[PDB]
């Protein structure tokens, strides 16, 4: 029973494969749809299976996706580095089923659940950290995510407290635990596979990969620098859906493109006489400058720790992916340091 659109058609109390039990829908996609299972053959213990809609091409993504997932699992048998679990897969009827550890609300929905108000800069620390630990694994084992975003670092738990912003004289909803995991291994490539040319969501791509200069582990750094400035403000760093002006939108927040970069690049028509082709005084240019500021502007207090935080978002946004700072490195920065 496939719908017009190729999800599986399913009511809560259905069983797949005489073994998973449904309880309730998690989530939906255009590529299929989670469901919360009982696994009876797991002791009961409760999953999150994935079911991927009856389409070839999403298919063999999903095969992809499993064989990413089964490297994980392999070089992680004590589930200590912070990328998603998977316990289980099969192919029921054309639908690619894949069975995950249960996890709560991804980073961003508790951040729109919570009207956009930012996480507290202690919470910003340890979920940037374990941010940082479950990609350096991916990195250390020759795979980049590329698809690095809130919606795919889902809290473990994200059962909450009401918290009270004296500040912002709001109320706020505060996760009781940051312990998050990296989810969504559906566009992550091996060293020695076929790269996609552009990789990433908009918002979170890397200038190298923008300008097609070749993309590798470093681009997954730059996501990440977008991703903590995203949970300590509260908006998207690059707000755009268009090259030239989110090249712009880099130039005004971190400041001019390397030579270098805009020498090598085929995107030519982004460039003007060595620099970019942007007009400030336009009205497309007014948008950029008032949407955007440079980097360090968007600090909300003057006290050590922000700044400490700024120093480590700057470095991951450095331009040249060569030296840009590694995940190793990063885990060493002192905005780190008051983490246990
Ligand atoms: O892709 C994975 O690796 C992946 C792995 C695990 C979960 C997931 C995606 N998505 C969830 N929720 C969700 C929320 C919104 C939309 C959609 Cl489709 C799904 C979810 C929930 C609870 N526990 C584990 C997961």
Same mark, same amino acid.
């Given at each position: 029973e496939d719908d017009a659109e190729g999800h599986l058609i399913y009511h809560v109390g259905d069983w797949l494969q005489e073994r998973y039990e449904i309880v309730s829908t998690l989530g939906e996609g255009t590529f299929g749809r989670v469901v919360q299972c009982v696994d009876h053959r797991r002791g009961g213990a409760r999953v999150a299976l994935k079911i991927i809609k009856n389409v070839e091409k999403y298919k063999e993504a999903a095969r992809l996706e499993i064989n990413v997932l089964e490297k994980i699992n392999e070089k992680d048998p004590d589930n200590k580095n912070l990328c998603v679990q998977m316990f289980d897969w099969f192919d029921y009827h054309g639908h690619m089923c894949i069975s995950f550890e249960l996890l709560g609300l991804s980073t961003f929905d508790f951040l729109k659940d919570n009207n956009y108000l930012p996480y507290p800069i202690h919470q910003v620390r340890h979920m940037a950290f374990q941010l940082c630990q479950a990609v350096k694994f991916l990195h250390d084992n020759? +795979?980049?995510? =590329?698809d690095l975003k809130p919606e795919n670092i889902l809290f473990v738990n994200s059962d909450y407290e009401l918290t009270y912003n004296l500040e912002k004289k709001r109320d706020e909803r505060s996760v009781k635990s940051t312990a998050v995991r990296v989810v969504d291994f559906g566009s992550a490539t091996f060293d020695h596979e076929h790269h996609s040319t552009i990789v990433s969501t908009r918002h979170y791509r890397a200038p190298e990969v923008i300008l097609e200069l070749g993309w590798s582990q470093p681009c997954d750094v730059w996501s990440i620098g977008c991703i903590i400035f995203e949970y300590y403000?509260?908006? =998207?760093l690059f707000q755009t859906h268009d090259n030239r002006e989110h090249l712009a939108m880099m130039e005004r927040i971190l400041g001019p493109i390397p030579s270098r970069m805009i020498r090598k690049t085929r995107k030519q028509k982004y460039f003007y006489r060595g620099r +970019?082709?942007?007009? @400030?005084? =336009?009205s497309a240019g007014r948008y950029v400058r008032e949407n955007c500021k440079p980097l360090?502007?968007? +600090? =909300?207090? @003057?006290?050590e720790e922000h700044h400490q935080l700024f120093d480590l978002i700057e470095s991951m946004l450095e331009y040249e992916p060569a030296k840009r700072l590694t995940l190793g490195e990063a885990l060493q920065h002192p905005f780190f340091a008051r983490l246990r």
């Open positions: 020759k +795979l980049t995510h =590329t403000v509260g908006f =998207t +970019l082709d942007w007009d @400030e005084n =336009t360090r502007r968007y +600090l =909300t207090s @003057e006290a």
